[PDB]
Amino acid sequence: MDFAIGDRVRLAAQPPYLKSADPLPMLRPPDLLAVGEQGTITGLRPGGYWVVLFDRGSFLLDTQFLSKVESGASSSEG
């Protein structure tokens, strides 16, 4: 390993509604990630949510797709 997570977050088709309800204040800012794809995920294990830490910083998200590999193959390269 290296990042210690076993689950890396990345892009995978624009998110439907990202936010699950009303967690973080980031619902739809004038400048979202759109570049912070590659990131680390450390959710569920501790509680039952999902956290993606990328260049941009770190925001809440769901197992959907955007910023959360999971699918094991959700990308189109550069």
JSON list of N, CA and C in Angstrom, two decimals:
[
{"chain": "A", "resi": 1, "resn": "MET", "atom": "N", "xyz": [0.83, -1.20, 0.00]},
{"chain": "A", "resi": 1, "resn": "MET", "atom": "CA", "xyz": [0.00, 0.00, 0.00]},
{"chain": "A", "resi": 1, "resn": "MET", "atom": "C", "xyz": [0.86, 1.26, 0.00]},
{"chain": "A", "resi": 2, "resn": "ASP", "atom": "N", "xyz": [0.29, 2.36, 0.46]},
{"chain": "A", "resi": 2, "resn": "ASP", "atom": "CA", "xyz": [1.01, 3.63, 0.51]},
{"chain": "A", "resi": 2, "resn": "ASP", "atom": "C", "xyz": [0.16, 4.71, 1.17]},
{"chain": "A", "resi": 3, "resn": "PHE", "atom": "N", "xyz": [-1.06, 4.88, 0.68]},
{"chain": "A", "resi": 3, "resn": "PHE", "atom": "CA", "xyz": [-1.97, 5.88, 1.23]},
{"chain": "A", "resi": 3, "resn": "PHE", "atom": "C", "xyz": [-2.75, 5.32, 2.42]},
{"chain": "A", "resi": 4, "resn": "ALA", "atom": "N", "xyz": [-2.74, 3.99, 2.55]},
{"chain": "A", "resi": 4, "resn": "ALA", "atom": "CA", "xyz": [-3.44, 3.33, 3.64]},
{"chain": "A", "resi": 4, "resn": "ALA", "atom": "C", "xyz": [-4.94, 3.62, 3.58]},
{"chain": "A", "resi": 5, "resn": "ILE", "atom": "N", "xyz": [-5.65, 2.87, 2.74]},
{"chain": "A", "resi": 5, "resn": "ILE", "atom": "CA", "xyz": [-7.09, 3.04, 2.60]},
{"chain": "A", "resi": 5, "resn": "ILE", "atom": "C", "xyz": [-7.71, 1.88, 1.83]},
{"chain": "A", "resi": 6, "resn": "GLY", "atom": "N", "xyz": [-6.95, 1.33, 0.88]},
{"chain": "A", "resi": 6, "resn": "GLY", "atom": "CA", "xyz": [-7.44, 0.22, 0.08]},
{"chain": "A", "resi": 6, "resn": "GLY", "atom": "C", "xyz": [-8.51, 0.64, -0.91]},
{"chain": "A", "resi": 7, "resn": "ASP", "atom": "N", "xyz": [-8.90, 1.91, -0.85]},
{"chain": "A", "resi": 7, "resn": "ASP", "atom": "CA", "xyz": [-9.92, 2.43, -1.75]},
{"chain": "A", "resi": 7, "resn": "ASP", "atom": "C", "xyz": [-9.57, 3.84, -2.21]},
{"chain": "A", "resi": 8, "resn": "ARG", "atom": "N", "xyz": [-9.23, 3.97, -3.49]},
{"chain": "A", "resi": 8, "resn": "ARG", "atom": "CA", "xyz": [-8.87, 5.27, -4.05]},
{"chain": "A", "resi": 8, "resn": "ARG", "atom": "C", "xyz": [-10.05, 5.90, -4.77]},
{"chain": "A", "resi": 9, "resn": "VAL", "atom": "N", "xyz": [-10.25, 7.20, -4.56]},
{"chain": "A", "resi": 9, "resn": "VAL", "atom": "CA", "xyz": [-11.35, 7.92, -5.19]},
{"chain": "A", "resi": 9, "resn": "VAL", "atom": "C", "xyz": [-10.89, 8.60, -6.48]},
{"chain": "A", "resi": 10, "resn": "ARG", "atom": "N", "xyz": [-11.74, 8.53, -7.50]},
{"chain": "A", "resi": 10, "resn": "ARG", "atom": "CA", "xyz": [-11.42, 9.14, -8.79]},
{"chain": "A", "resi": 10, "resn": "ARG", "atom": "C", "xyz": [-12.70, 9.53, -9.53]},
{"chain": "A", "resi": 11, "resn": "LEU", "atom": "N", "xyz": [-12.53, 10.19, -10.67]},
{"chain": "A", "resi": 11, "resn": "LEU", "atom": "CA", "xyz": [-13.67, 10.62, -11.48]},
{"chain": "A", "resi": 11, "resn": "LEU", "atom": "C", "xyz": [-14.38, 9.42, -12.11]},
{"chain": "A", "resi": 12, "resn": "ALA", "atom": "N", "xyz": [-15.62, 9.63, -12.52]},
{"chain": "A", "resi": 12, "resn": "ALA", "atom": "CA", "xyz": [-16.41, 8.57, -13.14]},
{"chain": "A", "resi": 12, "resn": "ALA", "atom": "C", "xyz": [-17.81, 9.06, -13.49]},
{"chain": "A", "resi": 13, "resn": "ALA", "atom": "N", "xyz": [-17.89, 9.94, -14.48]},
{"chain": "A", "resi": 13, "resn": "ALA", "atom": "CA", "xyz": [-19.17, 10.48, -14.92]},
{"chain": "A", "resi": 13, "resn": "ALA", "atom": "C", "xyz": [-19.73, 11.45, -13.89]},
{"chain": "A", "resi": 14, "resn": "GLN", "atom": "N", "xyz": [-19.90, 12.71, -14.29]},
{"chain": "A", "resi": 14, "resn": "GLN", "atom": "CA", "xyz": [-20.43, 13.73, -13.40]},
{"chain": "A", "resi": 14, "resn": "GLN", "atom": "C", "xyz": [-21.46, 13.14, -12.44]},
{"chain": "A", "resi": 15, "resn": "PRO", "atom": "N", "xyz": [-21.39, 13.57, -11.17]},
{"chain": "A", "resi": 15, "resn": "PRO", "atom": "CA", "xyz": [-22.31, 13.10, -10.13]},
{"chain": "A", "resi": 15, "resn": "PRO", "atom": "C", "xyz": [-23.73, 13.61, -10.33]},
{"chain": "A", "resi": 16, "resn": "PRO", "atom": "N", "xyz": [-24.72, 12.79, -9.93]},
{"chain": "A", "resi": 16, "resn": "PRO", "atom": "CA", "xyz": [-26.14, 13.14, -10.06]},
{"chain": "A", "resi": 16, "resn": "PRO", "atom": "C", "xyz": [-26.55, 14.26, -9.11]},
{"chain": "A", "resi": 17, "resn": "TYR", "atom": "N", "xyz": [-26.17, 14.11, -7.84]},
{"chain": "A", "resi": 17, "resn": "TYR", "atom": "CA", "xyz": [-26.50, 15.11, -6.83]},
{"chain": "A", "resi": 17, "resn": "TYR", "atom": "C", "xyz": [-25.45, 15.14, -5.73]},
{"chain": "A", "resi": 18, "resn": "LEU", "atom": "N", "xyz": [-24.29, 14.56, -6.02]},
{"chain": "A", "resi": 18, "resn": "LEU", "atom": "CA", "xyz": [-23.19, 14.52, -5.05]},
{"chain": "A", "resi": 18, "resn": "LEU", "atom": "C", "xyz": [-23.73, 14.42, -3.63]},
{"chain": "A", "resi": 19, "resn": "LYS", "atom": "N", "xyz": [-23.83, 15.56, -2.96]},
{"chain": "A", "resi": 19, "resn": "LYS", "atom": "CA", "xyz": [-24.33, 15.60, -1.59]},
{"chain": "A", "resi": 19, "resn": "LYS", "atom": "C", "xyz": [-25.46, 14.59, -1.39]},
{"chain": "A", "resi": 20, "resn": "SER", "atom": "N", "xyz": [-25.48, 13.96, -0.22]},
{"chain": "A", "resi": 20, "resn": "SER", "atom": "CA", "xyz": [-26.50, 12.97, 0.10]},
{"chain": "A", "resi": 20, "resn": "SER", "atom": "C", "xyz": [-27.77, 13.65, 0.62]},
{"chain": "A", "resi": 21, "resn": "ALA", "atom": "N", "xyz": [-27.59, 14.75, 1.34]},
{"chain": "A", "resi": 21, "resn": "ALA", "atom": "CA", "xyz": [-28.71, 15.49, 1.89]},
{"chain": "A", "resi": 21, "resn": "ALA", "atom": "C", "xyz": [-28.33, 16.94, 2.19]},
{"chain": "A", "resi": 22, "resn": "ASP", "atom": "N", "xyz": [-27.74, 17.15, 3.36]},
{"chain": "A", "resi": 22, "resn": "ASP", "atom": "CA", "xyz": [-27.32, 18.49, 3.77]},
{"chain": "A", "resi": 22, "resn": "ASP", "atom": "C", "xyz": [-26.12, 18.42, 4.72]},
{"chain": "A", "resi": 23, "resn": "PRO", "atom": "N", "xyz": [-25.14, 17.58, 4.37]},
{"chain": "A", "resi": 23, "resn": "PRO", "atom": "CA", "xyz": [-23.93, 17.39, 5.18]},
{"chain": "A", "resi": 23, "resn": "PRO", "atom": "C", "xyz": [-23.02, 18.62, 5.14]},
{"chain": "A", "resi": 24, "resn": "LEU", "atom": "N", "xyz": [-22.09, 18.64, 4.20]},
{"chain": "A", "resi": 24, "resn": "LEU", "atom": "CA", "xyz": [-21.17, 19.76, 4.06]},
{"chain": "A", "resi": 24, "resn": "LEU", "atom": "C", "xyz": [-21.84, 20.94, 3.37]},
{"chain": "A", "resi": 25, "resn": "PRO", "atom": "N", "xyz": [-21.28, 22.15, 3.59]},
{"chain": "A", "resi": 25, "resn": "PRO", "atom": "CA", "xyz": [-21.81, 23.38, 3.00]},
{"chain": "A", "resi": 25, "resn": "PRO", "atom": "C", "xyz": [-21.59, 23.44, 1.49]},
{"chain": "A", "resi": 26, "resn": "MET", "atom": "N", "xyz": [-20.77, 22.53, 0.98]},
{"chain": "A", "resi": 26, "resn": "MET", "atom": "CA", "xyz": [-20.48, 22.48, -0.45]},
{"chain": "A", "resi": 26, "resn": "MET", "atom": "C", "xyz": [-21.58, 21.73, -1.20]},
{"chain": "A", "resi": 27, "resn": "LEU", "atom": "N", "xyz": [-22.58, 22.47, -1.65]},
{"chain": "A", "resi": 27, "resn": "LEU", "atom": "CA", "xyz": [-23.70, 21.88, -2.39]},
{"chain": "A", "resi": 27, "resn": "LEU", "atom": "C", "xyz": [-23.55, 22.13, -3.89]},
{"chain": "A", "resi": 28, "resn": "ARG", "atom": "N", "xyz": [-23.01, 23.29, -4.24]},
{"chain": "A", "resi": 28, "resn": "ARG", "atom": "CA", "xyz": [-22.81, 23.65, -5.63]},
{"chain": "A", "resi": 28, "resn": "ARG", "atom": "C", "xyz": [-22.15, 25.02, -5.76]},
{"chain": "A", "resi": 29, "resn": "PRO", "atom": "N", "xyz": [-20.87, 25.09, -5.37]},
{"chain": "A", "resi": 29, "resn": "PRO", "atom": "CA", "xyz": [-20.09, 26.33, -5.42]},
{"chain": "A", "resi": 29, "resn": "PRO", "atom": "C", "xyz": [-19.79, 26.76, -6.85]},
{"chain": "A", "resi": 30, "resn": "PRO", "atom": "N", "xyz": [-19.27, 27.99, -7.01]},
{"chain": "A", "resi": 30, "resn": "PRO", "atom": "CA", "xyz": [-18.93, 28.55, -8.32]},
{"chain": "A", "resi": 30, "resn": "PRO", "atom": "C", "xyz": [-17.71, 27.86, -8.94]},
{"chain": "A", "resi": 31, "resn": "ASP", "atom": "N", "xyz": [-17.05, 27.02, -8.15]},
{"chain": "A", "resi": 31, "resn": "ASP", "atom": "CA", "xyz": [-15.87, 26.30, -8.62]},
{"chain": "A", "resi": 31, "resn": "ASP", "atom": "C", "xyz": [-15.68, 25.01, -7.83]},
{"chain": "A", "resi": 32, "resn": "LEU", "atom": "N", "xyz": [-16.20, 23.91, -8.36]},
{"chain": "A", "resi": 32, "resn": "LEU", "atom": "CA", "xyz": [-16.08, 22.61, -7.70]},
{"chain": "A", "resi": 32, "resn": "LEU", "atom": "C", "xyz": [-14.73, 21.97, -8.00]},
{"chain": "A", "resi": 33, "resn": "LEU", "atom": "N", "xyz": [-14.64, 20.66, -7.79]},
{"chain": "A", "resi": 33, "resn": "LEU", "atom": "CA", "xyz": [-13.40, 19.93, -8.04]},
{"chain": "A", "resi": 33, "resn": "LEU", "atom": "C", "xyz": [-12.97, 20.06, -9.50]},
{"chain": "A", "resi": 34, "resn": "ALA", "atom": "N", "xyz": [-13.52, 19.21, -10.35]},
{"chain": "A", "resi": 34, "resn": "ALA", "atom": "CA", "xyz": [-13.20, 19.24, -11.77]},
{"chain": "A", "resi": 34, "resn": "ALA", "atom": "C", "xyz": [-11.69, 19.27, -11.99]},
{"chain": "A", "resi": 35, "resn": "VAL", "atom": "N", "xyz": [-10.97, 18.44, -11.25]},
{"chain": "A", "resi": 35, "resn": "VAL", "atom": "CA", "xyz": [-9.52, 18.37, -11.36]},
{"chain": "A", "resi": 35, "resn": "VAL", "atom": "C", "xyz": [-8.91, 17.63, -10.18]},
{"chain": "A", "resi": 36, "resn": "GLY", "atom": "N", "xyz": [-9.65, 17.58, -9.07]},
{"chain": "A", "resi": 36, "resn": "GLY", "atom": "CA", "xyz": [-9.16, 16.90, -7.88]},
{"chain": "A", "resi": 36, "resn": "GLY", "atom": "C", "xyz": [-9.53, 15.43, -7.87]},
{"chain": "A", "resi": 37, "resn": "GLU", "atom": "N", "xyz": [-9.88, 14.90, -9.03]},
{"chain": "A", "resi": 37, "resn": "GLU", "atom": "CA", "xyz": [-10.26, 13.49, -9.15]},
{"chain": "A", "resi": 37, "resn": "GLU", "atom": "C", "xyz": [-9.47, 12.63, -8.17]},
{"chain": "A", "resi": 38, "resn": "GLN", "atom": "N", "xyz": [-8.33, 12.12, -8.63]},
{"chain": "A", "resi": 38, "resn": "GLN", "atom": "CA", "xyz": [-7.48, 11.28, -7.80]},
{"chain": "A", "resi": 38, "resn": "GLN", "atom": "C", "xyz": [-7.54, 11.72, -6.34]},
{"chain": "A", "resi": 39, "resn": "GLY", "atom": "N", "xyz": [-7.91, 10.79, -5.46]},
{"chain": "A", "resi": 39, "resn": "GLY", "atom": "CA", "xyz": [-8.00, 11.10, -4.05]},
{"chain": "A", "resi": 39, "resn": "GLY", "atom": "C", "xyz": [-8.11, 9.86, -3.18]},
{"chain": "A", "resi": 40, "resn": "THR", "atom": "N", "xyz": [-8.10, 10.05, -1.87]},
{"chain": "A", "resi": 40, "resn": "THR", "atom": "CA", "xyz": [-8.20, 8.93, -0.93]},
{"chain": "A", "resi": 40, "resn": "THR", "atom": "C", "xyz": [-9.57, 8.90, -0.26]},
{"chain": "A", "resi": 41, "resn": "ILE", "atom": "N", "xyz": [-10.07, 7.69, -0.01]},
{"chain": "A", "resi": 41, "resn": "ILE", "atom": "CA", "xyz": [-11.37, 7.53, 0.63]},
{"chain": "A", "resi": 41, "resn": "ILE", "atom": "C", "xyz": [-11.23, 6.82, 1.98]},
{"chain": "A", "resi": 42, "resn": "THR", "atom": "N", "xyz": [-11.84, 7.40, 3.01]},
{"chain": "A", "resi": 42, "resn": "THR", "atom": "CA", "xyz": [-11.79, 6.83, 4.35]},
{"chain": "A", "resi": 42, "resn": "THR", "atom": "C", "xyz": [-13.14, 6.93, 5.04]},
{"chain": "A", "resi": 43, "resn": "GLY", "atom": "N", "xyz": [-14.15, 6.32, 4.44]},
{"chain": "A", "resi": 43, "resn": "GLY", "atom": "CA", "xyz": [-15.49, 6.35, 5.02]},
{"chain": "A", "resi": 43, "resn": "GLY", "atom": "C", "xyz": [-16.02, 4.97, 5.32]},
{"chain": "A", "resi": 44, "resn": "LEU", "atom": "N", "xyz": [-17.20, 4.91, 5.94]},
{"chain": "A", "resi": 44, "resn": "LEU", "atom": "CA", "xyz": [-17.82, 3.64, 6.28]},
{"chain": "A", "resi": 44, "resn": "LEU", "atom": "C", "xyz": [-17.09, 2.97, 7.44]},
{"chain": "A", "resi": 45, "resn": "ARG", "atom": "N", "xyz": [-15.83, 2.61, 7.20]},
{"chain": "A", "resi": 45, "resn": "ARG", "atom": "CA", "xyz": [-15.02, 1.96, 8.23]},
{"chain": "A", "resi": 45, "resn": "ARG", "atom": "C", "xyz": [-15.30, 2.55, 9.60]},
{"chain": "A", "resi": 46, "resn": "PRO", "atom": "N", "xyz": [-15.06, 3.86, 9.74]},
{"chain": "A", "resi": 46, "resn": "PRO", "atom": "CA", "xyz": [-15.28, 4.58, 11.00]},
{"chain": "A", "resi": 46, "resn": "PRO", "atom": "C", "xyz": [-16.77, 4.71, 11.34]},
{"chain": "A", "resi": 47, "resn": "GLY", "atom": "N", "xyz": [-17.54, 5.20, 10.37]},
{"chain": "A", "resi": 47, "resn": "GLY", "atom": "CA", "xyz": [-18.97, 5.37, 10.59]},
{"chain": "A", "resi": 47, "resn": "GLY", "atom": "C", "xyz": [-19.80, 4.75, 9.48]},
{"chain": "A", "resi": 48, "resn": "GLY", "atom": "N", "xyz": [-20.33, 5.59, 8.60]},
{"chain": "A", "resi": 48, "resn": "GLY", "atom": "CA", "xyz": [-21.15, 5.10, 7.51]},
{"chain": "A", "resi": 48, "resn": "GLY", "atom": "C", "xyz": [-21.24, 6.09, 6.36]},
{"chain": "A", "resi": 49, "resn": "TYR", "atom": "N", "xyz": [-20.29, 7.02, 6.31]},
{"chain": "A", "resi": 49, "resn": "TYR", "atom": "CA", "xyz": [-20.27, 8.03, 5.27]},
{"chain": "A", "resi": 49, "resn": "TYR", "atom": "C", "xyz": [-19.09, 7.82, 4.33]},
{"chain": "A", "resi": 50, "resn": "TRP", "atom": "N", "xyz": [-18.71, 8.87, 3.61]},
{"chain": "A", "resi": 50, "resn": "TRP", "atom": "CA", "xyz": [-17.59, 8.80, 2.68]},
{"chain": "A", "resi": 50, "resn": "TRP", "atom": "C", "xyz": [-16.86, 10.14, 2.60]},
{"chain": "A", "resi": 51, "resn": "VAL", "atom": "N", "xyz": [-15.54, 10.09, 2.70]},
{"chain": "A", "resi": 51, "resn": "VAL", "atom": "CA", "xyz": [-14.72, 11.30, 2.64]},
{"chain": "A", "resi": 51, "resn": "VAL", "atom": "C", "xyz": [-13.64, 11.18, 1.57]},
{"chain": "A", "resi": 52, "resn": "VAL", "atom": "N", "xyz": [-13.59, 12.15, 0.67]},
{"chain": "A", "resi": 52, "resn": "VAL", "atom": "CA", "xyz": [-12.60, 12.15, -0.40]},
{"chain": "A", "resi": 52, "resn": "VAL", "atom": "C", "xyz": [-11.64, 13.33, -0.25]},
{"chain": "A", "resi": 53, "resn": "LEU", "atom": "N", "xyz": [-10.37, 13.03, 0.01]},
{"chain": "A", "resi": 53, "resn": "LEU", "atom": "CA", "xyz": [-9.35, 14.06, 0.17]},
{"chain": "A", "resi": 53, "resn": "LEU", "atom": "C", "xyz": [-8.49, 14.18, -1.09]},
{"chain": "A", "resi": 54, "resn": "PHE", "atom": "N", "xyz": [-8.70, 15.25, -1.84]},
{"chain": "A", "resi": 54, "resn": "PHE", "atom": "CA", "xyz": [-7.95, 15.48, -3.07]},
{"chain": "A", "resi": 54, "resn": "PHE", "atom": "C", "xyz": [-7.36, 16.89, -3.09]},
{"chain": "A", "resi": 55, "resn": "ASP", "atom": "N", "xyz": [-6.60, 17.19, -4.13]},
{"chain": "A", "resi": 55, "resn": "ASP", "atom": "CA", "xyz": [-5.97, 18.50, -4.27]},
{"chain": "A", "resi": 55, "resn": "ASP", "atom": "C", "xyz": [-6.88, 19.60, -3.72]},
{"chain": "A", "resi": 56, "resn": "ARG", "atom": "N", "xyz": [-8.08, 19.71, -4.29]},
{"chain": "A", "resi": 56, "resn": "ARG", "atom": "CA", "xyz": [-9.04, 20.72, -3.86]},
{"chain": "A", "resi": 56, "resn": "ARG", "atom": "C", "xyz": [-9.10, 20.79, -2.34]},
{"chain": "A", "resi": 57, "resn": "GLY", "atom": "N", "xyz": [-9.03, 19.63, -1.69]},
{"chain": "A", "resi": 57, "resn": "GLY", "atom": "CA", "xyz": [-9.08, 19.58, -0.24]},
{"chain": "A", "resi": 57, "resn": "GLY", "atom": "C", "xyz": [-9.75, 18.32, 0.27]},
{"chain": "A", "resi": 58, "resn": "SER", "atom": "N", "xyz": [-11.04, 18.42, 0.59]},
{"chain": "A", "resi": 58, "resn": "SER", "atom": "CA", "xyz": [-11.79, 17.29, 1.10]},
{"chain": "A", "resi": 58, "resn": "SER", "atom": "C", "xyz": [-13.26, 17.64, 1.27]},
{"chain": "A", "resi": 59, "resn": "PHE", "atom": "N", "xyz": [-14.13, 16.83, 0.67]},
{"chain": "A", "resi": 59, "resn": "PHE", "atom": "CA", "xyz": [-15.57, 17.06, 0.75]},
{"chain": "A", "resi": 59, "resn": "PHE", "atom": "C", "xyz": [-16.32, 15.74, 0.91]},
{"chain": "A", "resi": 60, "resn": "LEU", "atom": "N", "xyz": [-17.56, 15.83, 1.37]},
{"chain": "A", "resi": 60, "resn": "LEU", "atom": "CA", "xyz": [-18.39, 14.64, 1.57]},
{"chain": "A", "resi": 60, "resn": "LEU", "atom": "C", "xyz": [-18.98, 14.17, 0.25]},
{"chain": "A", "resi": 61, "resn": "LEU", "atom": "N", "xyz": [-19.20, 12.86, 0.15]},
{"chain": "A", "resi": 61, "resn": "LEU", "atom": "CA", "xyz": [-19.76, 12.27, -1.06]},
{"chain": "A", "resi": 61, "resn": "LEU", "atom": "C", "xyz": [-20.35, 10.89, -0.78]},
{"chain": "A", "resi": 62, "resn": "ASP", "atom": "N", "xyz": [-20.98, 10.30, -1.79]},
{"chain": "A", "resi": 62, "resn": "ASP", "atom": "CA", "xyz": [-21.58, 8.98, -1.64]},
{"chain": "A", "resi": 62, "resn": "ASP", "atom": "C", "xyz": [-20.86, 7.96, -2.52]},
{"chain": "A", "resi": 63, "resn": "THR", "atom": "N", "xyz": [-21.25, 6.69, -2.38]},
{"chain": "A", "resi": 63, "resn": "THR", "atom": "CA", "xyz": [-20.64, 5.62, -3.15]},
{"chain": "A", "resi": 63, "resn": "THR", "atom": "C", "xyz": [-21.01, 5.73, -4.63]},
{"chain": "A", "resi": 64, "resn": "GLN", "atom": "N", "xyz": [-21.83, 6.72, -4.96]},
{"chain": "A", "resi": 64, "resn": "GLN", "atom": "CA", "xyz": [-22.25, 6.94, -6.34]},
{"chain": "A", "resi": 64, "resn": "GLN", "atom": "C", "xyz": [-21.15, 6.55, -7.31]},
{"chain": "A", "resi": 65, "resn": "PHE", "atom": "N", "xyz": [-20.30, 7.52, -7.66]},
{"chain": "A", "resi": 65, "resn": "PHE", "atom": "CA", "xyz": [-19.20, 7.28, -8.58]},
{"chain": "A", "resi": 65, "resn": "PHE", "atom": "C", "xyz": [-18.15, 8.38, -8.47]},
{"chain": "A", "resi": 66, "resn": "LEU", "atom": "N", "xyz": [-18.52, 9.58, -8.91]},
{"chain": "A", "resi": 66, "resn": "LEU", "atom": "CA", "xyz": [-17.61, 10.72, -8.86]},
{"chain": "A", "resi": 66, "resn": "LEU", "atom": "C", "xyz": [-16.81, 10.73, -7.56]},
{"chain": "A", "resi": 67, "resn": "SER", "atom": "N", "xyz": [-15.49, 10.74, -7.68]},
{"chain": "A", "resi": 67, "resn": "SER", "atom": "CA", "xyz": [-14.61, 10.74, -6.51]},
{"chain": "A", "resi": 67, "resn": "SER", "atom": "C", "xyz": [-14.86, 9.51, -5.65]},
{"chain": "A", "resi": 68, "resn": "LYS", "atom": "N", "xyz": [-14.65, 8.34, -6.23]},
{"chain": "A", "resi": 68, "resn": "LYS", "atom": "CA", "xyz": [-14.84, 7.08, -5.52]},
{"chain": "A", "resi": 68, "resn": "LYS", "atom": "C", "xyz": [-14.87, 5.90, -6.48]},
{"chain": "A", "resi": 69, "resn": "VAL", "atom": "N", "xyz": [-13.68, 5.44, -6.88]},
{"chain": "A", "resi": 69, "resn": "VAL", "atom": "CA", "xyz": [-13.56, 4.32, -7.80]},
{"chain": "A", "resi": 69, "resn": "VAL", "atom": "C", "xyz": [-14.69, 3.31, -7.59]},
{"chain": "A", "resi": 70, "resn": "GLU", "atom": "N", "xyz": [-14.48, 2.40, -6.64]},
{"chain": "A", "resi": 70, "resn": "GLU", "atom": "CA", "xyz": [-15.48, 1.38, -6.34]},
{"chain": "A", "resi": 70, "resn": "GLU", "atom": "C", "xyz": [-15.69, 0.45, -7.53]},
{"chain": "A", "resi": 71, "resn": "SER", "atom": "N", "xyz": [-16.40, 0.95, -8.55]},
{"chain": "A", "resi": 71, "resn": "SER", "atom": "CA", "xyz": [-16.68, 0.17, -9.74]},
{"chain": "A", "resi": 71, "resn": "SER", "atom": "C", "xyz": [-15.45, -0.65, -10.15]},
{"chain": "A", "resi": 72, "resn": "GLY", "atom": "N", "xyz": [-14.27, -0.18, -9.75]},
{"chain": "A", "resi": 72, "resn": "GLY", "atom": "CA", "xyz": [-13.05, -0.88, -10.09]},
{"chain": "A", "resi": 72, "resn": "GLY", "atom": "C", "xyz": [-12.54, -0.54, -11.47]},
{"chain": "A", "resi": 73, "resn": "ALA", "atom": "N", "xyz": [-13.28, 0.31, -12.17]},
{"chain": "A", "resi": 73, "resn": "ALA", "atom": "CA", "xyz": [-12.89, 0.73, -13.52]},
{"chain": "A", "resi": 73, "resn": "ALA", "atom": "C", "xyz": [-13.86, 1.77, -14.07]},
{"chain": "A", "resi": 74, "resn": "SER", "atom": "N", "xyz": [-13.75, 3.00, -13.57]},
{"chain": "A", "resi": 74, "resn": "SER", "atom": "CA", "xyz": [-14.62, 4.08, -14.01]},
{"chain": "A", "resi": 74, "resn": "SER", "atom": "C", "xyz": [-13.80, 5.31, -14.41]},
{"chain": "A", "resi": 75, "resn": "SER", "atom": "N", "xyz": [-13.19, 5.24, -15.59]},
{"chain": "A", "resi": 75, "resn": "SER", "atom": "CA", "xyz": [-12.37, 6.34, -16.09]},
{"chain": "A", "resi": 75, "resn": "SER", "atom": "C", "xyz": [-12.21, 6.26, -17.60]},
{"chain": "A", "resi": 76, "resn": "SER", "atom": "N", "xyz": [-11.61, 7.29, -18.19]},
{"chain": "A", "resi": 76, "resn": "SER", "atom": "CA", "xyz": [-11.40, 7.34, -19.63]},
{"chain": "A", "resi": 76, "resn": "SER", "atom": "C", "xyz": [-10.02, 7.88, -19.96]},
{"chain": "A", "resi": 77, "resn": "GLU", "atom": "N", "xyz": [-9.14, 7.89, -18.96]},
{"chain": "A", "resi": 77, "resn": "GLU", "atom": "CA", "xyz": [-7.78, 8.38, -19.15]},
{"chain": "A", "resi": 77, "resn": "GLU", "atom": "C", "xyz": [-7.79, 9.85, -19.56]},
{"chain": "A", "resi": 78, "resn": "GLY", "atom": "N", "xyz": [-6.60, 10.40, -19.80]},
{"chain": "A", "resi": 78, "resn": "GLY", "atom": "CA", "xyz": [-6.49, 11.79, -20.20]},
{"chain": "A", "resi": 78, "resn": "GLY", "atom": "C", "xyz": [-7.08, 12.05, -21.57]}
]
